[PDB]
RNA sequence: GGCUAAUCCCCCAUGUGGACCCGCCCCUUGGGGUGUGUCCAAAGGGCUUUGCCCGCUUCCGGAUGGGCCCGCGUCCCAUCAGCUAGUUGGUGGGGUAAUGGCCCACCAAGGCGACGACGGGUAGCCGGUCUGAGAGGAUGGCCGGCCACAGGGGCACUGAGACACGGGCCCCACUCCUACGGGAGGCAGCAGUUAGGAAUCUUCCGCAAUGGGCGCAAGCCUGACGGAGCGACGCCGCUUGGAGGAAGAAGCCCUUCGGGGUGUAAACUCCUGAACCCGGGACGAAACCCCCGACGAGGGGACUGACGGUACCGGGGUAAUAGCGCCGGCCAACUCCGUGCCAGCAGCCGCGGUAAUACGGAGGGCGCGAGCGUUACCCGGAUUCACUGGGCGUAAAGGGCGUGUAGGCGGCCUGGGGCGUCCCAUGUGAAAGACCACGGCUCAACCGUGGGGGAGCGUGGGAUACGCUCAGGCUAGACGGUGGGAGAGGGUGGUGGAAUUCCCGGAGUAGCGGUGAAAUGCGCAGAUACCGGGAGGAACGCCGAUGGCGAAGGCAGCCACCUGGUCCACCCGUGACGCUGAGGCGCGAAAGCGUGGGGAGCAAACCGGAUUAGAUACCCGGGUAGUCCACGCCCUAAACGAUGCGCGCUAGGUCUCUGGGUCUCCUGGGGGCCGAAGCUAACGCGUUAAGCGCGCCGCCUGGGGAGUACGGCCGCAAGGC
RNA sequence: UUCCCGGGCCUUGUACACACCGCCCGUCACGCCAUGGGAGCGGGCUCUACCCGAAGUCGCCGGGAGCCUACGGGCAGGCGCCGAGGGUAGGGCCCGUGACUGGGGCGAAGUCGUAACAAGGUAGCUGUACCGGAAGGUGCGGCUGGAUCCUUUCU
C-alpha cells in the first residue's frame, strides 16, 4: 500500500521532471485530478489525461520545461522548480483564511483543499475560506 | 524524530550550570583570607601569581586572584570577592576587589583606576 | 452578694405576608402556584409634637458581594510503577446558607494508574514583563485581579459575613514581669531599632484633596491616602557657554632635527546670563453648610490648601562641575619611554625572556558623557533540543535478530452523518500595559480622552474538499488456491572414507623430533620410517565459487525421516483483511557457570628448553580447564553493510545464482562490479541508494570523568541491563 | 647491485608536522582539587502498631448530688468520641561530622617501562577467560577499521 498518494504524485512529478521526461503516470484518484487541474490551469504542466494501464486507471501528466540553454549544461529551466507537501498523514495542517501562506511573493502557489473545493491561495482568499494546506509549488 | 515521537517525548530544555557558587548568585561576597600565597601558572607562562584563600559568608572556602601591581593583603584580611577566573591558574574562580574593605587600591595607578580601585590624583 | 434604664432579653396579640408537614396543579433535580393544619413579627427616638424627620418589623424583587460545582489549561525526576480502606459506590442519618464520603451507621467491592497514578524536588497563579524576525525562551518586583498567611500547631465563639494581622481558648518556642503561686507579649501596618547581607529610605508634613467607618447633623477617626525627605536605582529634560580669535604663542609629546601634534584649543575681544538677590505669586476647591424654593428639582450665595511663599511670572544678575572605559584581532582608536617568561595582563586565541601598537607611565586617539565601567543573573546570537528549524556508513547517534501488545499511520468508488477542519453572526476576552490618533504639563519622561487590534472559550447559523465515522461496492495492496523450482535454513536418527593419537603383530636399526641455530623431549624395556589388524574421539578434503540458505546469531561428507522460509507460472478464491511497533515474549557467536557424560587432536593456566642485556612475551617440548554430547543457566561482541522496517518513484552497462518464456534475447527473484540524474565534508553512494518521497520504531546533542558511582531489576557466579 | 653509506623517482600506511633524535599509553615520585566506599557518632523527616492526651465542637447523664424555674425546661458540673502534641517499639529515606579506604582529575614535568601510531619491529581491534602489581600476555571466537609478493636500546 501507499501511505500518501498525494505526496506520491507530487514526487512522481518531481522525479520525472528532473530527468526531463515528457510525461509521467500517476495512479488515478479524483482528488489527484483536482490538484492536476490546478497545476494545468496555473501553467506548471501542459495538462493531463485519464489513461488505462494494464486495465487500471491512471493519470498521464504531461510535463513542461523551459527553452534549451547555452554554455556547459544546455538543460532547460524547470517550470516546476519546487513542488512540496505541507500537510501529511501524521501531521495534518489546516490554515484559517487569515493564515493562508503567500508563496514566493506571489510568484508561487499554495494549494488548499476547502469545503468549497480545491483552490489556490488566491482563489481561496477571494473565496474567503481556509482549509487543509496540501502542497506549495513554485 | 517522527512528529509522533516528538509528541510522545519532546525536546529537552538545556539547563545551564553556574560558573560561580558565590552561592545565591550575588554580584559579590565578603570573606576573610586564610592563606595569602603565590602560585605558579601553567605551561606557556611563568610568573609568581598572587592569590588568596578565602572563607566566605556563603560557608564556602575558595581561591581568589589579587589583581594589580602590589597588595596589602595577608592573614585575617577582610575582602570582597567578585568572580571571574584566571585562565592560566587552575581552580581560581573569583577575583578580589581592590579598594573595598581591607584591600587598598593600587598605589600610583594612572590608567584605568576604577578597576584596581584607586582614586584620582591632583595634577601637580 | 445588692439596686437599675433602654432601640438589652422574653411572653400573649394582630398575620399583609412567610416557614414546615400532607394533598393538588403547572414546571421538571430542591422552580412557580394553591388548599387545610401548625408555627413566626416589631422599638423606639428627635423635632417648632397635630405633622414631619430619624429609625423598627414581615415579605417580594433589584443592585452589589460571595460560597459550592464542572470542561479545558497550568514546572523537574520514571535512578518514583504500581497507589488506595472514608478507599470507590449505595440506603439512611448528621452537619451547612447550600451540593458533597463533608461526617457517621449499615451494605456492596470497588476507585485511580504508562493519556504517568503514588513518591520526591522546586514553586503562590494571572493581567503582564524582558528578550526574540518570529515561533519560542525566561520571568511574575512595582501597578491591577485572585489565592494564602499574620511567631509554630490545633480550635471554635460573636456576627450578614471570620474560624478573624492590631478578637478569644489550648499546646509549643522565644522575650519580659514575678512576693515563685503565677502573669504580659506577637511591626509579613507607618516610621524606626537590631541581626543577617554585596545591598534597600524619614521614628517628617497634612486631613487641604480622593477614598473609608460612625453620626440627623455639627463633627470625630483614618501611617488608606495626598505630600515632602533620603539614595544618579531608573527614565526624561537641562547646565558647565556663544560668536570672533595665529600658517598658529608657552608648556607637554613625536622627530629623518627640516618639522609634525595637542590646537581655535588657550590667552584675548565681544555678546548671552545657570547659579544667586528683589518683587508678585498659584491651579489643585466646591461640595458638606447658608438663602429662595418644598430639607426635592431648579436658582443664588459664603467657609476651607499639608504641598508652599513651592511651581510659575516680572525686575536684577556672575563665564560659571567633567568624568569614565578603551585604543593586538573580534572592535572605533598608535606612537615614545620604562620593564625583560619579571612585574604583570587576560572574555577567547593569546601577550611579556631587549625595538612590547597586548605589561606600566606618558603624548595622542576612539567611545560614551553626569555618568562610565565591573560582577551577577535572564533572552539573544545558539538552526547548539531544530514546531518554525538538526541529525545517525566513517564526525555523537540504527536497538544483536525476530514475533507481536498498546499506540501511530492507511488503496479505489459511492451514499448518510458533520466530530476534526473552514466561514458568518453574537457573547466573553475588566482596568492598566502594548499599538494608533488627538490632547495636558514651555519639551519630554509622565499623564488625559478616543479608536483599533486580539489568541482562546460559550451560543446560534452555514460549508463538505480533506481527516473521522457508519453503510454499500471494487481489486491494483495483502492473504489464499493449483502447479512447478533452487537451497551448508532447522530438528532427530543412522552411516562413509581420509588423517592424528593409542593398543596388538610382522619386518627392521640408530636415531627421531624440532629450530635462525639449538636444547628440553622421545629412542637399545628397540623409537623414527614400512606393512597388517584393532580401539576411540573430533572434523568433513576434492566438489567449492567472486556460489547458496536463514530474520539475525549462523549453516558444509552421505542417507532417511520431521519441519520453517522463499521464488516463479496460471489469474482461479477472499475483498483492504495493510505498514510499523514502546512494553512483553522468543532466538541469540565465542568464552563462561551447574549436573552428568565423553576426551583422539588442539590447548588459557601451568611445568620445562635454547634465545639472549631481563621474562612471566614472541621460537621449541609437555600440559590441565576448556574445546565435544545431554540438560539447565549466561545475553555479551568490530552481534558490521559499523547503513532499522515497509512502500512508491528516478539512465544504462557488465558478471553471476535461481524460475518462466514464442530462449541473439525477453521477463521475475537473489548476489556482485562500474556508472545517469541526484546526493555527500570529503571518502564515497548511485533501481541491493547514502537519490526523490510518505509511514512507524530506535538513537544522538563537545572531549575527558565513565559504561565509572549510586539506586533498581536480572544471574548460582562471572557479571548483565 | 644481494649487503653497508649517501641520494633520486613512483607508490603505500601513518595517531608524525619542534616532522621517528617524532608521538602517545602506562608506572613510581612530588604538590593541588573534587568525589566513591565507609565503622561509628550528631541531628532532622516519615510510616505502622500500641499507650498518654490540652482547647474546643458535638453526643449522652444532668440523679432526695448544686443553681434558676412560669415545672415545660435552662445553667453549672460529669462522662464519651474526635483531637494539636508527647511517650514506647520497629521499618524506611534525608542532612552533618567521619577512623580506615578506591580510583579520578589537573599541575612543575622529573623517574622507569615501550603497550599503540609505519608490518610500530609478535598486524591491530574486539567479547569473554586465565596469568600479571600494572603496562600487558595468552586461549577461544569474531571484525578489517591490516602493510606486503635470529629476539634488532634510549635520544
Ligand atoms: Mg518521456
Ligand atoms: Mg485535460
Ligand atoms: Mg521540490
Ligand atoms: Mg509547517
Ligand atoms: Mg481555531
Ligand atoms: Mg509581506
Ligand atoms: Mg608566556
Ligand atoms: Mg448579682
Ligand atoms: Mg425590677
Ligand atoms: Mg392572607
Ligand atoms: Mg404569636
Ligand atoms: Mg429586638
Ligand atoms: Mg415592649
Ligand atoms: Mg414621636
Ligand atoms: Mg451575584
Ligand atoms: Mg482510614
Ligand atoms: Mg467506615
Ligand atoms: Mg446523603
Ligand atoms: Mg472521604
Ligand atoms: Mg487521561
Ligand atoms: Mg506528583
Ligand atoms: Mg514557596
Ligand atoms: Mg517558576
Ligand atoms: Mg520587544
Ligand atoms: Mg525585537
Ligand atoms: Mg532557541
Ligand atoms: Mg512571546
Ligand atoms: Mg510562570
Ligand atoms: Mg516588595
Ligand atoms: Mg499586588
Ligand atoms: Mg500558617
Ligand atoms: Mg516575624
Ligand atoms: Mg516557632
Ligand atoms: Mg497561630
Ligand atoms: Mg453585623
Ligand atoms: Mg480582627
Ligand atoms: Mg488568630
Ligand atoms: Mg485566616
Ligand atoms: Mg501588629
Ligand atoms: Mg483588625
Ligand atoms: Mg490575654
Ligand atoms: Mg501568646
Ligand atoms: Mg515597620
Ligand atoms: Mg553586618
Ligand atoms: Mg519612602
Ligand atoms: Mg499630623
Ligand atoms: Mg477628608
Ligand atoms: Mg469623605
Ligand atoms: Mg487615633
Ligand atoms: Mg505614601
Ligand atoms: Mg569659543
Ligand atoms: Mg607650541
Ligand atoms: Mg593632559
Ligand atoms: Mg612646534
Ligand atoms: Mg553684562
Ligand atoms: Mg485653590
Ligand atoms: Mg478657587
Ligand atoms: Mg470636611
Ligand atoms: Mg426655608
Ligand atoms: Mg444647590
Ligand atoms: Mg528671571
Ligand atoms: Mg535681562
Ligand atoms: Mg571659563
Ligand atoms: Mg591577532
Ligand atoms: Mg563595539
Ligand atoms: Mg582596528
Ligand atoms: Mg621585576
Ligand atoms: Mg588594561
Ligand atoms: Mg565574564
Ligand atoms: Mg632598555
Ligand atoms: Mg622597548
Ligand atoms: Mg615581542
Ligand atoms: Mg604600548
Ligand atoms: Mg587588552
Ligand atoms: Mg599601555
Ligand atoms: Mg541625562
Ligand atoms: Mg544565552
Ligand atoms: Mg533564532
Ligand atoms: Mg548543546
Ligand atoms: Mg525538525
Ligand atoms: Mg546537527
Ligand atoms: Mg573511530
Ligand atoms: Mg559513529
Ligand atoms: Mg543492524
Ligand atoms: Mg540489549
Ligand atoms: Mg512486525
Ligand atoms: Mg493495531
Ligand atoms: Mg485509524
Ligand atoms: Mg481515503
Ligand atoms: Mg462523505
Ligand atoms: Mg462541525
Ligand atoms: Mg486590555
Ligand atoms: Mg503637546
Ligand atoms: Mg493574547
Ligand atoms: Mg466564537
Ligand atoms: Mg458552532
Ligand atoms: Mg451533504
Ligand atoms: Mg468498506
Ligand atoms: Mg502465492
Ligand atoms: Mg505451493
Ligand atoms: Mg518442467
Ligand atoms: Mg541444510
Ligand atoms: Mg535440510
Ligand atoms: Mg541437516
Ligand atoms: Mg585410521
Ligand atoms: Mg611394532
Ligand atoms: Mg612424550
Ligand atoms: Mg635419554
Ligand atoms: Mg634412552
Ligand atoms: Mg641393548
Ligand atoms: Mg631387535
Ligand atoms: Mg608411530
Ligand atoms: Mg596402521
Ligand atoms: Mg580410549
Ligand atoms: Mg575451497
Ligand atoms: Mg558467500
Ligand atoms: Mg537475508
Ligand atoms: Mg558473518
Ligand atoms: Mg518446503
Ligand atoms: Mg479474478
Ligand atoms: Mg467479488
Ligand atoms: Mg520489542
Ligand atoms: Mg549465546
Ligand atoms: Mg560455548
Ligand atoms: Mg561445563
Ligand atoms: Mg565436566
Ligand atoms: Mg600438543
Ligand atoms: Mg647467546
Ligand atoms: Mg636468561
Ligand atoms: Mg635487547
Ligand atoms: Mg606451546
Ligand atoms: Mg563486517
Ligand atoms: Mg552496535
Ligand atoms: Mg533513516
Ligand atoms: Mg531458461
Ligand atoms: Mg538482477
Ligand atoms: Mg560505485
Ligand atoms: Mg554525477
Ligand atoms: Mg540528502
Ligand atoms: Mg564530487
Ligand atoms: Mg570522486
Ligand atoms: Mg527500487
Ligand atoms: Mg543491475
Ligand atoms: Mg529503498
Ligand atoms: Mg549521508
Ligand atoms: Mg562533559
Ligand atoms: Mg560492561
Ligand atoms: Mg542514583
Ligand atoms: Mg550495582
Ligand atoms: Mg540475587
Ligand atoms: Mg565483563
Ligand atoms: Mg555482584
Ligand atoms: Mg639507502
Ligand atoms: Mg631519475
Ligand atoms: Mg607521495
Ligand atoms: Mg601518504
Ligand atoms: Mg591502516
Ligand atoms: Mg600535531
Ligand atoms: Mg577521600
Ligand atoms: Mg568519602
Ligand atoms: Mg483516647
Ligand atoms: Mg474535652
Ligand atoms: Mg464544624
Ligand atoms: Mg428534667
Ligand atoms: Mg457542658
Ligand atoms: Mg484517640
Ligand atoms: Mg504521634
Ligand atoms: Mg610522565
Ligand atoms: Mg617488546
Ligand atoms: Mg601488542
Ligand atoms: Mg611497541
Ligand atoms: Mg605489534
Ligand atoms: Mg595494525
Ligand atoms: Mg583477548
Ligand atoms: Mg590478580
Ligand atoms: Mg608478557
Ligand atoms: Mg601467559
Ligand atoms: Mg584471534
Ligand atoms: Mg585494522
Ligand atoms: Mg595476503
Ligand atoms: Mg624469538
Ligand atoms: Mg639494530
Swiss-Prot record, chain A:
The keyword Ribosomal protein applies. GO terms for molecular function: rRNA binding; structural constituent of ribosome. GO terms for cellular component: ribonucleoprotein complex; ribosome. The keyword Ribonucleoprotein applies. Part of the 30S ribosomal subunit. Contacts proteins S2, S5 and S12. Belongs to the universal ribosomal protein uS8 family. This is Small ribosomal subunit protein uS8. It comes from Thermus thermophilus (strain ATCC 27634 / DSM 579 / HB8). The gene is rpsH.
Amino acid at each position: 500500500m501507499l501511505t500518501d498518494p498525494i505526496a506520491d504524485m507530487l514526487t512522481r512529478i518531481r522525479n520525472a521532471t528532473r530527468v526531463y521526461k515528457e510525461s509521467t503516470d500517476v495512479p488515478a484518484s479524483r482528488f489527484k485530478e483536482e490538484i492536476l487541474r490546478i497545476l494545468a490551469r496555473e501553467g506548471f504542466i501542459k495538462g493531463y489525461e485519464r489513461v488505462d494501464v494494464d486495465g487500471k486507471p491512471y493519470l498521464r501528466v504531461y510535463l513542461k520545461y523551459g527553452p534549451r540553454r547555452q554554455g556547459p549544461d544546455p538543460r532547460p529551466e524547470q517550470v516546476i522548480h519546487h513542488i512540496r507537501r505541507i500537510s501529511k498523514p501524521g501531521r495534518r495542517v489546516y490554515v484559517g483564511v487569515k493564515e493562508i501562506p503567500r508563496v514566493r511573493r506571489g510568484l508561487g502557489i499554495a494549494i488548499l483543499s476547502t469545503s468549497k473545493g480545491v483552490l489556490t491561495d488566491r482563489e481561496a482568499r477571494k473565496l474567503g475560506v481556509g482549509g487543509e494546506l496540501i502542497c506549495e509549488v513554485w | 524524530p517522527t512528529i509522533n515521537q516528538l509528541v510522545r517525548k519532546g525536546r529537552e530544555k538545556v539547563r545551564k550550570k553556574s560558573k560561580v557558587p558565590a552561592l545565591k548568585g550575588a554580584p559579590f561576597r565578603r570573606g576573610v583570607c586564610t592563606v595569602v600565597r603565590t602560585v605558579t601558572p601553567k605551561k606557556p607562562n611563568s610568573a609568581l601569581r598572587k592569590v588568596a584563600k578565602v572563607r566566605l559568608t556563603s560557608g564556602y572556602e575558595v581561591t581568589a586572584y589579587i589583581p594589580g601591581e602590589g597588595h596589602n593583603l595577608q592573614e585575617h584580611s577582610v575582602v570582597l570577592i567578585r568572580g571571574g577566573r584566571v585562565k592560566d591558574l587552575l581552580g581560581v574562580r573569583y577575583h578580589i576587589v581592590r579598594g573595598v574593605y581591607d584591600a587598598a587600591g593600587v598605589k600610583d595607578r594612572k590608567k584605568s583606576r576604577s578597576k584596581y580601585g584607586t582614586k584620582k590624583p591632583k595634577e601637580a
